């Protein structure tokens, strides 16, 4: 979310939010949780 | 009596296989979630190439 | 609890989905396959087509209606009473059957 | 209390329910649940009944945790005649239990 | 003169096990913070942080698989240790037969 | 691309694991079903005696 503020200020797209709350799930001990963030940052890079 | 005990021991082991974490349903969820991530991330990779 | 987990997974996966970019059913099939203990993804796709043709439950449910309800009236992680929630449960039960 | 939980064999969510609301399990209202043998035997019977419900248990327990369970749903779960459970409930209501 | 009827016991029931699920709510996002790094640098930073998290996730999956399999390994030993006693009783009664 | 290859190795490991664990559960349900006939045979041996 700090990289997302940097994005929403280098460009002016205050509406664009890429990080979703669903990355962690306690049912499955939060396994795989980081690979959703990796995908979300790859979207934040490619849209930039 | 010995054979009847073995029936219970097989039921206890089957129950442990169903009740543990790291069971079938966790791996099914991991496969589905990872496959969806994998295809999205492939579309990003090929766009970059 | 199984149905609740299915709803959470589908809602998280389909967030940000675009109608014109791809078919809703094809995008929704993998998460349904993951939650309902299916071996193959295409089996879930066929099951969803069959369910859409049956229109299960007392309130005839389909992928578009289900997606709209999930988008609007669902708050994951909380136990709340919703008028349409019974139709959602009936549709999920039909899929498992 | 671990030795209790493992010996009883009860499922995780019904154990949570038992800890949080002893009244649902019929322990004396307003008191912490007892691990007295008198409570142990009823917990074991509850775990056995849940196991007997089989695959239906997932829905039955959820309907039990709400105030939702009815004669018809439980009769379908146990493969019994619905009229049988309805009449058993009527007879139980007529007679003085404690 | 009357030979009684040789009533004969039926097959044992199939034991049945109940498999229930557990559910836990969705997560909640932290408050975002503004910081002095141009995006390419803060992205190389975060990407490094995330790859470290993925590495903890792979270690965690390996631990989960290992500990569950080792609890099964201990279960099979306690179960064969219990099965041996009846064989000892059977062998002893074979001696008395001879 | 190297990140994508890393998702591909995780995905292969998951596929292998979940399929083997579904076989593990199959062998338990299959031995649980095989035990019943042994119980019937042992019971009829008692009647033979």
From TrEMBL, chain A:
Residues of the full protein shown: 2274 to 2321 of 2516
Organism of derivation: Photorhabdus luminescens (Xenorhabdus luminescens)
Protein name: TcdA1
Domain of life from the UniProt record: Bacteria
